[PDB]
Structure of Inner capsid protein VP2:
Amino acid sequence: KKMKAIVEDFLKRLHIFDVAVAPDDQMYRLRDRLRLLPVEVRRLDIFNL
Amino acid sequence: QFDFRNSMHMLTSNLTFTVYSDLLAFVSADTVEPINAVAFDNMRIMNEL
């Protein structure tokens, strides 16, 4: 799964950027940065269930 | 002087066959899907997604 789509959705939903400017490389670097953070409890339990 | 008992001779050869030179029309090589290509260390060629 080409994971740039999820980052593009996130950036667009923030409602201040235009995805036509920021390239894919920063999206992938942001994804790698984002993987570290532990997820919220409710969503973690939803995924576990 | 023309001598017949020594001029006569018998030839040796194969019955019949076909000449092959291409040696590449007898093999087919279908590539794997471009996304899942791996390297010598059994890790994927591009590990960024």
Remarks:
- Chain A is about 60% helix and 0% strand.
- Chain A touches chain B at residues 1-3, 28 (CB under 8 Å).
